[PDB]
Write a protein that binds this ligand. Structure first.
Ligand SMILES: Cn1nc(O)c2c1CN(C(=O)c1cc(O)cc(=O)o1)CC2
Length: 167
């Protein structure tokens, strides 16, 4: 039993809710919140911008030190950093950004990072400002992630479309 509430169950291991991931993280304090990161960990907008703002820019400060030491992530890759006031840990995962021309096949590699964590609160990778089709992202999630994932979808209209079209 865990503290996630109000989710619709899609599969054995994938759950979904119309929710603001920032507000959900603040309330649950999950072990892992996933950020929709880019390779530079520049958290300017979308989910990343919102998570970073909720940490009062502490996420960005930590991320800048990470990049200065380690260099950029790979598209499809990830790193574990602090969750600050939102979670124990933040798993920064880089899905492909279609608006930069990155290969959508890398979306599966991105979701594979979730399998290193037993339970996660996450957004749909490559959705929103990353330009991918969220219906496709949900399909890849369900077909790739084997650990327990709680998906937060900010837009109510999109949430309803994702549920109604789910096979
Ligand atoms: C600035 N702020 N603070 C918050 O709690 C939120 C925001 C803004 N926001 C996003 O930028 C966003 C975009 C998106 O595609 C998915 C998502 O989960 O969040 C949603 C929730």
């Amino acid at each position: 039993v865990n503290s996630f509430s109000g989710y619709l169950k899609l599969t054995d291991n994938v759950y979904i809710k119309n929710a603001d991931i920032v507000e959900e993280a603040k309330k649950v304090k999950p072990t892992v919140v996933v950020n929709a990161a880019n390779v530079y960990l520049k958290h300017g907008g979308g989910v990343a911008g919102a998570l970073n703002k909720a940490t009062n820019n502490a996420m960005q400060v930590e991320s800048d030190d990470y990049i200065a030491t380690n260099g950029p992530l790979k598209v499809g890759g990830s790193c574990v950093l602090s969750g600050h006031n939102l979670a124990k840990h933040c798993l920064h995962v880089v899905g492909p950004n279609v608006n930069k021309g990155e290969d959508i096949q890398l979306l599966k590699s991105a979701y594979e990072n979730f399998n290193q964590h037993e339970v996660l609160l996450a957004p749909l990778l490559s959705a929103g400002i990353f330009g991918a089709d969220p219906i496709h992202s949900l399909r890849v999630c369900v077909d790739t992630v084997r650990t327990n994932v709680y998906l937060a979808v900010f837009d109510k209209n999109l949430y309803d479309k994702l549920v109604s079209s789910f096979l």
